[PDB]
Design a protein around this ligand. Structure first.
Ligand SMILES: Nc1ncnc2c1ncn2[C@@H]1O[C@H](COP(=O)(O)OP(=O)(O)O)[C@@H](O)[C@H]1O
Ligand SMILES: [K+]
Ligand SMILES: [Mg+2]
Ligand SMILES: [Mg+2]
Length: 299
């Protein structure tokens, strides 16, 4: 931290204590967040912010540097060939992907499968030139369970069928049971702490994203307040995805969100499932057919 312009030993101590230990967090911080630290003037705040941005080279970029930036994005396999393809490779880090659908369509299944695949190193697709092995080593997932449907037995089962130790997935997956939107949101904000503690969080799951908000703000005469809270939550999720080069997945029960990728999943004939990608910044709307078996997501 003392590398930052104006930052001396005492200021560094105040920053680390306030949770600002990383440069990108300071570079992307507002003078407000830092002046709130007290002891941190708006003067020092502005200088260290400018210096962090510069140290992180956050200016204008063009040409080949645009490709290099896009290359820091790694993708997580869904275990479904059709789905991975419709995704343009797999689930993207640095973005929030939403899986919406009626009850029983398979949203929770995809969340579980994703926690398992994170542990199969060959399921993380990346350009070693832009993403080092160290960056994706010992990856851990965070599962914010809003419904109480997290099933450790299901994790074990999927893991085993994929040839991976079930307990190893459990050992590297943090589950947080949230009973309301307040807990749901705090948990997500506290993910930054798991990382500061040495945990390489590479996958964040929110299952589900909207249940709590809907039960708390049913009155469609306050839907604005709800939308406001949900908006702040989503913003926290997108920033988390970006700053920590992390894959973020959310589910939504249906009978629009700030998610960069949005799917509609419906149950097909028996085993079959159809995921329709209807929203993304660079992919065409397309459907992927797959199935859910005792092995998890397959085909
Ligand atoms: N162990 C299993 N073996 C085969 N299919 C399973 C297994 N566990 C769950 N499923 C399938 O997952 C479906 C439920 O998926 P789920 O993700 O919970 O739906 P939702 O979108 O409401 O969260 C079941 O109804 C069942 O067909
Ligand atoms: K300094
Ligand atoms: Mg992003
Ligand atoms: Mg579910």
């Amino acid at each position: 931290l003392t590398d930052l312009p104006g930052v001396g030993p005492s200021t560094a101590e105040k920053l680390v204590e306030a949770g600002y230990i990383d440069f990108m967090k300071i570079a992307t911080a507002t003078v407000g967040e830092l002046t709130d630290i007290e002891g941190i003037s708006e003067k020092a705040a502005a200088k260290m912010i400018m210096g962090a941005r510069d140290l992180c080279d956050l200016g204008f970029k063009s040409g080949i540097d645009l490709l290099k930036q896009r290359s820091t994005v790694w993708k997580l396999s869904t275990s479904s060939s059709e789905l991975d393809s419709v995704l343009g490779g797999g689930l993207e880090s640095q973005s929030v992907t939403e899986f919406a659908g009626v009850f029983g369509s398979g949203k929770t299944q995809i969340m579980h499968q994703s926690c398992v695949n994170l542990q199969n190193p060959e399921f993380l697709f990346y350009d070693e030139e832009a993403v080092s092995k160290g960056e994706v080593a010992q990856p851990k997932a965070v599962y914010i369970d809003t419904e109480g449907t997290f099933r450790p037995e299901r994790i074990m089962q999927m893991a085993e069928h994929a040839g991976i130790d079930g307990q190893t997935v459990l050992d590297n997956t943090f589950v947080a049971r949230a009973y309301n939107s307040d807990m749901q949101m705090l948990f997500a904000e506290k993910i930054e702490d798991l990382i500061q503690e040495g945990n390489n969080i590479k996958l964040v799951v929110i299952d589900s994203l909207t249940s709590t908000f809907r039960n708390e703000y049913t009155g469609r005469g306050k839907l604005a307040e709800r939308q406001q809270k949900l908006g702040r939550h989503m913003a926290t999720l997108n920033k988390l995805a970006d700053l920590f080069n992390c894959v973020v997945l959310v589910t939504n029960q249906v009978s629009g969100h700030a998610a960069t990728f949005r799917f509609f999943v419906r149950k097909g004939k028996g085993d079959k499932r159809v995921a329709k990608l209807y929203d993304s910044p660079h992919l065409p709307d397309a459907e992927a057919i797959f199935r859910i078996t005792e092995k998890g997501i397959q085909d």
